[PDB]
Amino acid sequence: QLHCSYESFDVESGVYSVSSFEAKPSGSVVEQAEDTKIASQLGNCVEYSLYGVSGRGVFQNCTAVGVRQQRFVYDAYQNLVGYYSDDGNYYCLRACVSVPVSVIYDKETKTHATLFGSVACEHISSTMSQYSRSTRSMLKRRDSTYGPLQTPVGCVLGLVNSSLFVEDCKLPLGQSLCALP
């Protein structure tokens, strides 16, 4: 993707943002009194239909906020903040968690590594249920032999805790972290 974005076969060294993981939705949740097994599923990332209102997200049982009778609670940008259901419970709706991705590239050694942002390594795995495009297998040639590594900037693959002190790698990751070659 980077080679295509710069129209070249010799991209300069740096840290570059790339396409994020979407999430990948689970089985649908439907409420519409007027077909019988999944009227609820408390907490995942699901498609839904609520009396003709549709979308997708994670539901969570939470303290009541809006005026019940009107059902659908909205914010100032008209996004569905929450829902009063026909079981009498208020459910908070927080959409789903996409995972930002960036890659570290050094042109001189022709090697690379990746960073998943502040999401934390508890949500990261060697293969992904979340989907964006094709594969990350070029990293996984070395990085499927290691665990994900938790850092102050984020969760990373292939980064190795060396605990070296270096003045400038020319590949800083933010905070005080640096991606040494």
Binding site: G14, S20, G55, S118, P152, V153, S176
Partner: protein, 463 residues
């Protein structure tokens, strides 16, 4: 209740008038009292760094929109290119600044540093009391880089309303700062530790490491206050200076202009992100702003026309946003260059220029970290209780015209003090206090027609 508004004229303060005179003597206005005071400034150095996942901002994973977006794929490539170039310039501006901030040498810093001066700026080994006031008083939205999306997940409060959670909706990513607040504090304490080693010439080589109180007295000799006054009034100087420091505890309200500028820098960063978020709900002739809605409600010949219109307005908004960010990034770089110059002229040295700083000549200034920039404090010396006195241009021997003298850093004034048994006396430039005229206070000059002809008691030259 309060009543009607009152029409008023804007007051004009007339400056104190002093009569210009002809002949060999003149009227001189000189201060007899003073107060220290503090003025502050905020200089922005950076913009919050962002990136945008262009494809995700325009379309949330739909295959029909993706097929159409292939026609416009070069626009997202250009958006990514421009944003990446802006972020590199921000990071380089920070590194260039901190390369000048670093000293080669410093003092250690302990509690009790500064002696008689209280110094609430001292680290609690940390940041400082002033930094903690500034960061808490400004209404700062919660930072990312800590677990972030996990506080927008179901494993967190129902009351989260953060722009962090709007990041994954819109495809934003706010990038981390390049320094770390602990490293910023290390640079800031290194500047504080260099103060009072920069006197006695140079300061770009040797490091003097002398007592802080003594360096202040040396700076006060540098603005024309005589050392006799400084020797007697040391306790009073410490008291006035500590009162001026005490006034900083009331300076974190929006009536303080420098504080108001810090708040608006934070508001502007939030404003830019909120603009892109709000535009996700705007149709551009579409039935709905959701691409999935118009996929469900329309047959494919009609559907694709509606999706294309929706894409065109979304791309146009991103282009406008990038243009805004490029302008802001450049203005921040220019502002960071000003900050670098003030650190090398007001923090590391005494300034003789005026203009910069509070208008009271200049003595020691300090720097602390702020949201998106540096916050300066400048201690100045402010006059009060001015009096008019008779003064002479210079003095000479009436018996020998080549024996002529002129005051150094001060004036020759007619005596009004009962300790002195001479017609003329010496005073400092910034503070009224008579003293005897001696060789230490004067220089030899060529004769002039306006110099006084002294017939008897002159001690430099005695002849």
């Amino acid at each position: 209740v309060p009543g009607e508004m009152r029409l008023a004229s804007i007051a004009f303060n007339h400056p104190i008038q002093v009569d210009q005179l002809n002949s060999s003597y003149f009227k001189l206005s000189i201060p007899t009292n003073f107060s220290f005071g503090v003025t502050q400034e905020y200089i922005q150095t950076t913009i919050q760094k962002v990136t945008v996942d262009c494809k995700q901002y325009v379309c949330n994973g739909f295959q029909k929109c993706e097929q159409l977006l292939r026609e416009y794929g070069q626009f997202c490539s250009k958006i990514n290119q421009a944003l990446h170039g802006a972020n590199l310039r921000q990071d380089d501006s920070v590194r260039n600044l901190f390369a000048s901030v670093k000293s080669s040498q410093s003092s250690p810093i302990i509690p009790g540093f500064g002696g008689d001066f209280n110094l609430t700026l001292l680290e609690p080994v940390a940041r400082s009391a002033i930094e903690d006031l500034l960061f808490d008083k400004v209404t700062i939205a919660d930072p990312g880089y800590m677990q972030g999306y996990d506080d927008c997940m179901q494993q967190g409060p129902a009351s989260a309303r953060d722009l962090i959670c709007a990041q994954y909706v819109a495809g934003y990513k706010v990038l981390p700062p390049l320094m770390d607040v602990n490293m910023e504090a290390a640079y800031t304490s290194s500047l504080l530790g260099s103060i009072a080693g920069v006197g006695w010439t140079a300061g770009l080589s040797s490091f003097a490491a002398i007592p802080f109180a003594q360096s202040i007295f040396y700076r006060l000799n540098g603005v024309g206050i005589t050392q006799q006054v400084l020797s007697e009034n040391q306790k009073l100087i410490a008291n006035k200076f500590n009162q001026a420091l005490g006034a900083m505890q009331t300076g974190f309200t929006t009536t303080n202009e420098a504080f108001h500028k810090v708040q608006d820098a934070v508001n502007n960063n939030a404003q830019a992100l909120s603009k892109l978020a709000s535009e996700l709900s705007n149709t551009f002739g579409a039935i709905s702003a959701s691409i999935g809605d118009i996929i469900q409600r329309l047959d494919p010949p009609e559907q694709d026309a509606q999706i294309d219109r929706l894409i065109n307005g979304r791309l146009t908004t991103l282009n406008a946003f990038v243009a805004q960010q490029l302008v802001r990034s450049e203005s921040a770089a220019l502002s960071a260059q000003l900050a670098k110059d003030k650190v090398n002229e007001c923090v590391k040295a005494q300034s003789k220029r005026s203009g910069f700083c509070g208008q009271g000549t200049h003595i020691v200034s300090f720097v602390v970290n702020a949201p998106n920039g540096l916050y300066f404090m400048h201690v100045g010396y402010y006059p009060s209780n001015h009096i008019e006195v008779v003064s002479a241009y210079g003095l000479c021997d009436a018996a020998n015209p080549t024996n002529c003298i002129a005051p150094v850093n001060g004036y020759f004034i007619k005596t009004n003090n009962t300790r002195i048994v001479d017609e003329w006396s010496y005073t400092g430039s910034s503070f009224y206090a008579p003293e005897p005229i001696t060789s230490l206070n004067t220089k030899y000059v060529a004769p002039q027609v306006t110099y006084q002809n002294i017939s008897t008691n002159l001690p430099p030259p005695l002849l």
